[PDB]
């Protein structure tokens, strides 16, 4: 068993179909997106409890930016990478307990998600990309 494509860049960690990068250093949501982009990845999208568990396990104990955003003024949250929102792991009350304009999402040390202002400075951020074929 396994995945035929399972190769990851150095400093990245493979999990199933994808590779993950756990970034450190204070960034607002958009700068975080840039850091992922510059490494040819994207802010992470999450599609299963198994992925979430792997992330909770490896991710910063403080908060991390992920690639989930509300862009349409109707509070519909979508992944930056065009994937759609099947799985969710929201904290209690979230996301509707958020304020108008809180268009971004962070992942807590526990793994659960909470909407947050995009201009928050967080000390961690998670990128992913598809594992390469060899």
Residue numbers in the entry: 156 to 289
Which sentences did the original study use to describe this structure?
The second principal receptor for IgE, CD23, is a type II transmembrane glycoprotein with a C-type lectin-like domain (CTLD)4 (3, 4). In its membrane-bound form, CD23 consists of three CTLD “heads” connected to the membrane via a trimeric α-helical coiled-coil “stalk”. The interaction between CD23 and IgE is critical in the regulation of IgE synthesis, which can be up- or down-regulated depending on the oligomerization state of CD23 (2, 9, 10). We have determined the crystal structures of the human lectin-like head domain of CD23 in its Ca2+-free and Ca2+-bound forms, as well as the crystal structure of the Ca2+-bound head domain of CD23 in complex with a subfragment of IgE-Fc consisting of the dimer of Cϵ3 and Cϵ4 domains (Fcϵ3-4).
To verify that the principal site is indeed the location of Ca2+ binding to derCD23 in solution, and to confirm the exact nature of the interaction, several single point mutations in derCD23 were generated: conserved residues were mutated within the principal (E249A and D270A) and auxiliary (S252A and D258A) calcium-binding sites, along with the highly conserved Asn-269 residue (N269A and N269D). As expected, the two principal binding site derCD23 mutants, E249A and D270A, were unable to bind Ca2+. D258A (auxiliary) and D270A (principal site) crystallized differently, and in all eight and seven molecules within the asymmetric unit, respectively, Pro-250 is trans. The crystal structures of the derCD23 principal and auxiliary Ca2+-binding site mutants were determined (but not those of N269A or N269D mutants). No major conformational changes were observed in either the principal or auxiliary Ca2+-binding sites upon introduction of the point mutations that could inadvertently affect the binding of Ca2+, with the exception of D258A.
